[PDB]
Amino acid sequence: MLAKRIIAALIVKDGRVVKGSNFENLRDSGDPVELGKFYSEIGIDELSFWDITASVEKRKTMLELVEKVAEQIDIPFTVGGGIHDFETASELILRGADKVEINTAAVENPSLITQIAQTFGSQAVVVYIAAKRVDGEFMVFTYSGKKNTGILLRDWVVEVEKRGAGEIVLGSIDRLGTKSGYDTEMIRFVRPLTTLPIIAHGGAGKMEHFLEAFLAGADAAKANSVFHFREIDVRELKEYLKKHGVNVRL
């Protein structure tokens, strides 16, 4: 096992952190660049930016975001979504992003994974897999949970690795937003199907959820509002995890 990673996820729109931040020490607590800079200073391992701008502004806003973030931070960052083709992924990586996160366009064109990997390496290619239980099967969902693709999680995972992806963000639509814990059953289901790093996403509410997700086989854990609304202190979380046997970077 490589050291576990703790990832702060920021939802951004029109250059702003959606829903903001409770950090009163910051000049603009809704500024994604200063928010991410703060995170890198207090021990977050990577950032993840997820843009929900509506084009015509999207493309320019996302490039501008990555340009500004890369000015200010030293730690790895990922950008997504609405990433639909190689040209879009490529400009974002070139402008400063370490990795891109793709979901819907990867499901609809799995060779998109391979096109990007062929130029930027597998490590630059994160596949976000959103899944949910449907009649007792884990099914893959696209379009921000709007579409049941009818594809089994089991099959998609294996395919994603085969096409050349470097990491899988495993999102549980069953736990997303709930603060009730990571979907450790989903993680344990995926763990033996792939040699790729698995990032848990969806469900974080307290520090113990992270320990549970790492026991399940996650390589990393991503969270949003528990960090921004300061329900979990990043330093406390890492101390907590190290205390209980987790190999985290301190």
E-state strands within 98-248: 99-102, 125-134, 137-142, 147-152, 167-172, 198-201, 220-223
Question: Hey, what domains does the chain have and what are their CATH numbers?
Answer: 1-250 (3.20.20.70)
Burial (CB < 10 A; 0-12, 13-18, 19+), residue 57, is: middle
Q: 12 is written with which tokens? A: 């951004």
What DSSP character marks residue 4? Answer: B
Experimental method: X-ray
E-state strands within the chain: 5-13, 16-17, 46-51, 77-80, 99-102, 125-134, 137-142, 147-152, 167-172, 198-201, 220-223
How many Cβ atoms are within 10 Å of 2's Cβ, its own excluded? 8
Query: Rounded to an integer, what distance in angstroms lies between the CA atom of residue 163 and that of residue 91?
Result: 21
How many Cβ atoms are within 10 Å of 231's Cβ, its own excluded? 15
Query: Rounded to an integer, what distance in angstroms lies between the CA atom of residue 13 and that of residue 177?
Result: 19
Of 11, 171, 195, nearest in space to 104 by CA? 171
Cα-based distances in Å from 106 to 18, 216, 234: 25, 26, 32
Phi, psi of 130 (to 5 degrees): -95, 125
Resolution in A: 2.2
What DSSP character marks residue 200? Answer: E
